[PDB]
Amino acid sequence: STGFLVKQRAFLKLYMITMTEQERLYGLKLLEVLRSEFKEIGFKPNHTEVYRSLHELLDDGILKQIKVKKEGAKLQEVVLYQFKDYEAAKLYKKQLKVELDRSKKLIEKALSDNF
Amino acid sequence: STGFLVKQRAFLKLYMITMTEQERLYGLKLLEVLRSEFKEIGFKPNHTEVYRSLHELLDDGILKQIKVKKEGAKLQEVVLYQFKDYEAAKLYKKQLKVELDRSKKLIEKALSDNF
DNA sequence: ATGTACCAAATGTTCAGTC
DNA sequence: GACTGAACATTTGGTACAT
């Protein structure tokens, strides 16, 4: 990298890991939660980057899919994620702290020099 | 836009606007002047970004490219930038405060949520 | 650290497809 | 109508160069 701010694909993946930790969820719920958690700041992610994020985590080996059923009254079927390789969730979580830390210095530094 | 972080280009341009205000934006080696500034944190732009950022403010009509005497000289000439459009520069700079404030909130939040 | 010119990467829009 | 998915294309950044 040239080491500028963290990229959205990364920021979202990290949030996926944090959320899997607390409750095994599926794509559109993850978005519901992120969207509303962030609706004051004005970050409005969309369902497909969230999905591409989860998807990458599968290639990374950090997550696995489990196909289960939902209770919308629709007898549908939903896809939850669960840790495959826990060590790699940790390692990914570590890399992003670094990235987010540099990112904090940059914005603060930028807010200082220019304002 | 979804409203994620500030864009790299918008971020360099902001510095250039400020450096112009401080009469610190002169010479061709703006890259090294900007690299030197961010070497601590670990941000290291390449020439083509600095070129692209610098050359947008000219084309957009915010900056003008001039020739003056190397501050204190008799003959030697260096390149200087001044405000062609100081209105469009102040407005823009305001836009960036918001853009940075919003960005701060996101990173403080990501760190607070995930760590 | 010019200025180009062609490359790769990040990600929004629209649609495919199933309940 | 709630859900998972992916091509396409843009807006962008990066590499490479001779200069």
Curated annotation (Swiss-Prot), chains A, B:
Coiled coil: none annotated. GO terms for molecular function: DNA binding. Keywords: DNA-binding. One of its GO terms (biological process) is DNA replication termination. Homodimer. Plays a role in DNA replication and termination (fork arrest mechanism). Two dimers of rtp bind to the two inverted repeat regions (IRI and IRII) present in the termination site. The binding of each dimer is centered on an 8 bp direct repeat. This is Replication termination protein. It comes from Bacillus spizizenii (strain ATCC 23059 / NRRL B-14472 / W23) (Bacillus subtilis subsp. spizizenii). The gene is rtp.
